Design a protein around this ligand. Structure first.
Ligand SMILES: O=S(=O)(c1cc(Cl)ccc1Cl)n1cnc2ccccc21
Length: 304
């Protein structure tokens, strides 16, 4: 009925705000990115620092794993993305083509493509093997805050400070849907649900919304947290009870019951905005990360 997340480890090492945290699909690792221009790798179960991956010339806003846990992609203010071999630390490719800061990135399920979004208002699709830009979508009229592929890679969802979420056909680049509710606040995050039927979207009016994108209908809203300024990730927690997890500008992690929408737990400990959360793929473990006055990542574990 309610989880019991408790703090287990605090991970120190980044020298500026953390920007994103992600667990590897195989459960072994946590990757973090930061405004300090670095990616760090940590053990997912013990929080033990593994190594630093460097090469970007300016801060990093996002990092994402390939589905086989072998590669990372990062998005930077240096206007590039980089594809990294995690085991060796090597930069395999630098993806150049955005005309402004790159803010968000993800691999497709087959990890043969990368999608990126930028302050240049575009969504781009890149070939992983060659590192070349395949398609540029004139997607939005303001910076693109998130991009994510659906379960089979046939669709991309993007979100933007223009107030819209858009769904794109990967193969053709056509805009298939635009989603917006009754107000127009910036959309700061979007992702498809694990089963691919829904989209979870955050807006800078203190609201998370679950959409049936096929029907174009908002089915659930999650409120009670504070999110008026920063692009804060949100997650589906799948391993125990069915929860929604998000950071907050009041320095807490919020956890809601997906079905009932009630808050079930708040996690206290960070000393600045919780900008990013991630949920472990097999264990009831949450990672949270905070902005410049805190600079740490925390690992929390629950029995359900
Ligand atoms: O499949 S889901 O995306 C999902 C969400 C979470 Cl938190 C954990 C696991 C899964 Cl599988 N999903 C979307 N709506 C749902 C309603 C009931 C059960 C699952 C639902």
């Amino acid at each position: 009925v309610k989880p019991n997340y408790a703090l287990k480890f605090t991970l120190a090492g980044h020298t500026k705000a953390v920007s994103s945290v992600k667990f590897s699909p195989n459960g072994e690792w946590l990757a973090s990115s930061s405004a300090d221009k670095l990616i760090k790798i940590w053990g997912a179960y013990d929080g033990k620092f593994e190594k630093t991956i460097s090469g970007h010339k300016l801060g990093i806003s996002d990092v994402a794993w390939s589905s086989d846990s072998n590669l990372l992609v990062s998005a930077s203010d240096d206007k590039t993305l980089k594809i990294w071999d995690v085991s060796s630390g090597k930069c395999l490719k630098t993806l150049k083509g955005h005309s402004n800061y790159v803010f968000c990135c993800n691999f497709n399920p087959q990890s043969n493509l990368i999608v990126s979004g930028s302050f240049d208002e575009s969504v781009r699709i890149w070939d992983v093997k060659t590192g070349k830009c395949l398609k540029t979508l004139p997607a939005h009229s303001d910076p693109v805050s998130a991009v994510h592929f659906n379960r089979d890679g046939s669709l991309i969802v993007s979100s933007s400070y223009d107030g819209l979420c858009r769904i794109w056909d990967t193969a053709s680049g056509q805009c298939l849907k635009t989603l917006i509710d009754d107000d127009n606040p910036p959309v700061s995050f979007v992702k498809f649900s694990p089963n691919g039927k829904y989209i979870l979207a955050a807006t800078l009016d203190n609201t998370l919304k679950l959409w049936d994108y096929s029907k174009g209908k908002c089915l659930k809203t999650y409120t009670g947290h504070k999110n008026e300024k920063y692009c804060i990730f949100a997650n589906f927690s799948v391993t125990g009870g069915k929860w929604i997890v998000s950071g907050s500008e009041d320095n807490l992690v919020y956890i809601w019951n997906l079905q009932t929408k009630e808050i079930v737990q708040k996690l206290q400990g960070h000393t600045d905005v919780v900008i990013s959360t991630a949920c472990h793929p097999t264990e009831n473990i949450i990672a949270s990360a905070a902005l410049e006055n805190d600079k740490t990542i925390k690992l929390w574990k629950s029995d359900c």
